[PDB]
């Protein structure tokens, strides 16, 4: 379902799966997508998150605190959570409603906030970033 | 959305198990090759078994090239950049052939198109040239 994803939006997902692999996690969840948005660095999502004071180490530290330690020999298959798949689907639906034929980093962050009830949304409101503020930051940076 | 088939998924699982068995710190192309043979049922397995590429023949050649590590890794094992390139080429191969899935046959095709890692070195040393492995897969399809 990544047909209209931009090269940097594709990069976001790649970094997400590499974070889940490094952190010894069994799924690619919404919080790994959030980490990938920050890791990408250059897109509208990364700039928006930086203007809100959301750092890579703060999200990663909050994620390890919630999930905890895993197995010594986990299964090598790391699929998306159903919640992360819904975020990706809502990313497409957000960009379609805006009249865009592409899906960039800003649409993935918007879709993440739209779902707004997983690990990523939980880590965001813990780091002092209410979800409605993240959306307005993304929208106001897309205006100019 | 995931394009990898169930058996291609099983190959990746076995590849991580195989690297941990050898106390290796990466999932390389040679562990992907061992996952193809370990899976057994797919097209890639039946092909390699035709060219005379046994499961112990590859494990033996891997031991001579790299050998056992000192400590067994814990958690997930990262892919080599070369193994990531193999998986990327497996997708490009399936797209060029007009398929929407990534099966074991596309993983072996992407493995030989990269053709410059431990797996490619092992295959040649076992007597199977890279172009001959490619055709045993294509005519089987």
């Amino acid at each position: 379902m990544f047909e209209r994803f931009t090269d940097r939006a594709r990069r976001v997902v790649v970094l997400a799966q590499e974070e889940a692999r490094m952190l010894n996690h069994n799924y690619i969840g919404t919080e790994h997508i959030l980490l990938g948005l920050i890791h990408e660095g250059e897109g509208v999502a990364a700039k928006s998150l930086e203007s809100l004071g959301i750092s890579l180490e703060g999200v990663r530290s909050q994620v390890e605190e919630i999930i905890g330690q895993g197995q010594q020999a986990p299964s090598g298959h790391i699929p998306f959570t159903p919640r992360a798949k819904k975020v990706l689907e809502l990313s497409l639906r957000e960009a379609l409603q805006l009249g865009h034929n592409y899906i960039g980093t800003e649409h993935i962050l918007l879709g993440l906030i739209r779902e707004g009830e997983g690990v990523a949304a939980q880590v965001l409101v813990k780091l002092g970033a209410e979800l409605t503020r993240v959306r307005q930051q993304v929208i106001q940076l897309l205006s100019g | 959305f995931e394009r990898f088939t169930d058996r291609a998924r099983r190959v990746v699982v076995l590849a991580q198990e195989e690297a941990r068995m050898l106390n290796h710190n990466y999932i390389g192309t040679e562990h992907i090759l061992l996952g193809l043979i370990h899976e057994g049922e797919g097209v890639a397995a039946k092909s390699l078994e035709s060219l005379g590429i046994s499961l112990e023949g590859v494990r033996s050649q891997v031991e001579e090239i790299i050998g056992q590590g000192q400590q067994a890794p814990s958690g997930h094992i990262p892919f080599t950049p070369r193994a990531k390139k193999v998986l990327e080429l497996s997708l490009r191969e399936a797209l060029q052939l007009g398929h929407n899935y990534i099966g074991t046959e596309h993983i072996l095709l992407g493995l030989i198109r990269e053709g410059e890692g431990v797996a490619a070195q092992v295959l040649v040393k076992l007597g199977a040239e890279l172009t001959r492995v490619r055709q045993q897969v294509i005519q089987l399809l």
Binding site: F2, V14, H77 | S90
Partner: peptide, 5 residues
């Protein structure tokens, strides 16, 4: 698992 290198 996504595979875009």
């Amino acid at each position: 698992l996504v595979a875009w290198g």
